[PDB]
From Swiss-Prot:
The protein's name in its UniProt record: Hexokinase-4
Superkingdom of the source species: Eukaryota
Pathway annotation: Carbohydrate metabolism; hexose metabolism; Carbohydrate degradation; glycolysis; D-glyceraldehyde 3-phosphate and glycerone phosphate from D-glucose: step 1/4
Result when mutating V411M: In HHF3; increased glucokinase activity based on measure of catalytic efficiency; increased affinity for glucose; decreased inhibition by GCKR; no effect on affinity for ATP
Variant or mutagenesis effect after changing G220R: In MODY2 and PNDM1; pathogenic; highly decreased glucokinase activity; decreased affinity for glucose
Enzyme Commission (EC) number: 2.7.1.1
Pfam families: Hexokinase_1, Hexokinase_2
Length: 420
């Protein structure tokens, strides 16, 4: 690797977070999580710590058979699941989303999904059963319900979905029974974890554990992050749909990562350190630097082809130095995101540790975590540094055979049943 530019590195150094900084964010997160959990403070808490009603014990035992509907991009799976004494047996069919039912209404698409569900039920002689249906991957539940009603020929309880963090935890638990945390680092960022029932003040009872959905993206409301915000973060915040809100998620999620990078590049441009002080019109356009471009730049093999390709698409004619500066800018933003995210997770893991040496599996999903080079590794290394006396295993949500997803639907249907 070459000797970096001093003046560029001084700007990029703004993004560094020291261990003392990360510990400070973590402690602050821990106090907000405490507020969220307590009856007295829950309403005013910015970090809601929502009880998910997913308990550490097998509940809703009368739910034996159910439908699982896995909705993807251009198709969907209809799966019949039987749960026994767990013995998760599945059968399924794949269906293709109609090619024209992407011009017409959301309502017409669900009539088609309904029809496929009916076909599956006919095939396995299950049309009469009043099966619950769990959805895997917001108001799709409402749309499916309406479309089944619209049909009348079979009866069904489309159950509430679980939050994506909870689905991540559950599906990962299927492959590793030590999984007690689910985390998403995608467009948004959130975590759920198995909390001691005594600490879940919003639910009566002291026995076992319940999954708590932190909704930690809202952290930062009270200025918990203000000392870590850079100019780019303030600009992103001011231009967002919700200024002053979701400050934490704004530092981490893919929704704004590309925008952060874009703003860094324009700073460098204006300091005459990049593109010889000349930005293109696409670069000057809000949202033009896509988050995927950050991972693409970071994927560059060393030849600068991927970077040149991205930057040329933005109407730039970058030198090799320009390409290298953009890379480092993408890395600084990504690394800062991984560090901020690690302080949140460390906060959860440390709290869990008090509440009992601790071995724990963390289930993780999301485009940023899965697809950004070195995000996950920097994230792991940082989390581990902040959690001494914890051994943390990280696993990804991987579709496999659809059994983790069957389990998600099982739990969601059982929870619904348990909740009347
Ligand atoms: O069903 C559950 N919880 C529910 N709340 C409400 C309705 S249903 C939980 C959810 C998990 C708990 C821990 C983290 C991930 C999810 N659940 C799911 C499978 C098994 S199990 O069947 O694997 C068992 C049988 C032998 C040992 C474990 C045990 C269990 O408690
Ligand atoms: O998708 C990750 C997360 O994005 C946003 O933070 C949503 O509020 C949250 O519920 C979800 O878990």
């Amino acid at each position: 690797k070459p000797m970096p530019l001093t003046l560029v590195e001084q700007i990029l150094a703004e993004f560094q977070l020291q261990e003392e900084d990360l510990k400070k964010v973590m402690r602050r997160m821990q106090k907000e999580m405490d507020r969220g959990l307590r009856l007295e403070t829950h309403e005013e808490a910015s970090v809601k710590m929502l009880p998910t009603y997913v308990r550490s014990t097998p509940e809703g035992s009368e739910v034996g058979d159910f439908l699982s509907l896995d909705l993807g991009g251009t198709n969907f799976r209809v799966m019949l699941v039987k749960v026994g004494e767990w013995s998760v047996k599945t059968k399924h069919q794949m269906y293709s989303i109609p090619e024209d039912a992407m011009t017409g209404t959301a309502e017409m698409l669900f009539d088609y999904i309904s029809e496929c569900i009916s076909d599956f039920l006919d095939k396995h002689q299950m049309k009469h059963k009043k099966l619950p249906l769990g959805f895997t991957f917001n108001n799709v539940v409402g749309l499916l319900r309406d479309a089944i009603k619209r049909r009348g020929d079979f009866e069904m309880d489309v159950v509430a979905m679980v939050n994506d963090t909870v689905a991540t935890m559950i599906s990962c638990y299927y492959e590793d029974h030590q999984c007690e945390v689910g985390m998403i680092v995608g467009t948004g960022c959130n975590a759920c974890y198995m909390e001691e029932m005594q600490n879940v003040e919003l639910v009566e009872g002291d026995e076992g554990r319940m999954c708590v959905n932190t909704e930690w993206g809202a952290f930062g409301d009270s200025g918990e992050l203000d000392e870590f915000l850079l100019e780019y973060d303030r600009l992103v915040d001011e231009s967002s749909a919700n200024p002053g809100q979701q400050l934490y998620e704004k530092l981490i999620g893919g929704k704004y990562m590309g925008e952060l990078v874009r703003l860094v590049l324009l700073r460098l441009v204006d300091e005459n350190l990049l593109f010889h002080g000349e930005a293109s019109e696409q670069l000057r356009t809000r949202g033009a630097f896509e988050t995927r471009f950050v991972s693409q730049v970071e994927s560059d093999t060393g030849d600068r082809k991927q970077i040149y390709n991205i930057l040329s698409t933005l109407g730039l004619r970058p030198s090799t130095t320009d390409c290298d500066i953009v890379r480092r800018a993408c890395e600084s933003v990504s690394t800062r995101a991984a560090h901020m995210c690690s302080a949140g997770l460390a906060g959860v893991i440390n709290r869990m540790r008090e509440s009992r040496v601790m071995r724990i599996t963390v289930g993780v999903d999301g485009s940023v975590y899965k697809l950004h080079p070195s995000f996950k590794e920097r994230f792991h290394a940082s989390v581990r540094r902040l959690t001494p006396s914890c051994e943390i295993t990280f696993i990804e949500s991987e579709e496999g055979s659809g059994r983790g997803a069957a389990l998600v639907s099982a739990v969601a249907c059982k929870k619904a049943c348990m909740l009347g």
